[PDB]
């Protein structure tokens, strides 16, 4: 579970991302499509090239859920229940892929937040996301 200090480091780090959140979104994705080619098997309908507006718009939506998530850190299973049903039932996206996004997302934060991304914050951030990933796979079976 996230310790109280974890919950503080996550909100402290996200607060600093700010208006750039949806910006970092598309970047975590591009890094994912490019680093782990396998991840783009779920996007036959998306122009995945760089510059792409679809890869940008989506990143904004990925940013929004982690913001709603940070907002409801003590109640993620209820605030992300909607998406969990969307990924497992309607998308059926294999659980080993979220571990893949969370890594690119984390690298993307190590690239823009060098002051804040200390070893302590890094760890709390690897937790927060693992907990998100978990919630998103709750409804697979």
């Amino acid at each position: 579970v996230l310790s109280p200090a974890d919950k503080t480091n996550v909100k402290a780090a996200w607060g600093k991302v700010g208006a750039h959140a949806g910006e970092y979104g598309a970047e975590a994705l591009e890094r994912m499509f490019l680093s782990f080619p396998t991840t783009k098997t779920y996007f036959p309908h998306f122009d995945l090239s760089h510059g792409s507006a679809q890869v940008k718009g989506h990143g904004k939506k990925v940013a929004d859920a982690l913001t709603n998530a940070v907002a409801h850190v003590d109640d993620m299973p209820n605030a992300l229940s909607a998406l969990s049903d969307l990924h497992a039932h309607k998308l059926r996206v294999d659980p080993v892929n979220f571990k893949l996004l969370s890594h690119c997302l984390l690298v993307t934060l190590a690239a823009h937040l060098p002051a804040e991304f200390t070893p302590a914050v890094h760890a709390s951030l690897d937790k927060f996301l693992a907990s998100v990933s978990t919630v998103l796979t709750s409804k697979y079976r």
Partner: protein, 146 residues
């Protein structure tokens, strides 16, 4: 991958009793049941509601047969596997959009179908050999994803 001669013959000999039509079908159907999300490819098949109609669907059986068959070819190419399924790794990728975890998934339920088929004969040394096959085979089939 290289296989210890007797560990290579445990594969060779046991395969010859495998009813590829019963094990092929059960390998796929038991996969569509256990890891639910794997149906994102099998929607054309039809009725996959309860684990019942999943197992009894003549499409699931039908496709598990040609899935096991191709496996039953790399069993000869037990040296260079890549230069065999590399063709199917293009397909399953570019055209078919299949996530490689599902192959890794197949190999494990298959290991279980065989043990459900040979009970006692499926000793640990034999399972272990059959693991060296399935993992390596899974990676050959997912070698050049771009």
């Amino acid at each position: 991958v290289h296989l210890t001669p007797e560990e290579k013959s445990a594969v060779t000999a046991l395969w010859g009793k495998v009813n590829v039509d019963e094990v092929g079908g059960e390998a796929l159907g038991r996969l569509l049941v256990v890891y639910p999300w794997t149906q994102r490819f099998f929607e054309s098949f039809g009725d996959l509601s309860t684990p019942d109609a999943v197992m009894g669907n003549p499409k699931v059986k039908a496709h598990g047969k040609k899935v096991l068959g191709a496996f039953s070819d790399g069993l000869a190419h037990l040296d260079n596997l890549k230069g065999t399924f590399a063709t199917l790794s293009e397909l399953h990728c570019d055209k078919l959009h299949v996530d490689p975890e599902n192959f890794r998934l197949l190999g494990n339920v298959l290991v279980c179908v065989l043990a459900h088929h040979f009970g006692k004969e499926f000793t640990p040394p034999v399972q272990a050999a059959y693991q060296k096959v399935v993992a390596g085979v899974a990676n050959a089939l997912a070698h050049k994803y771009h």
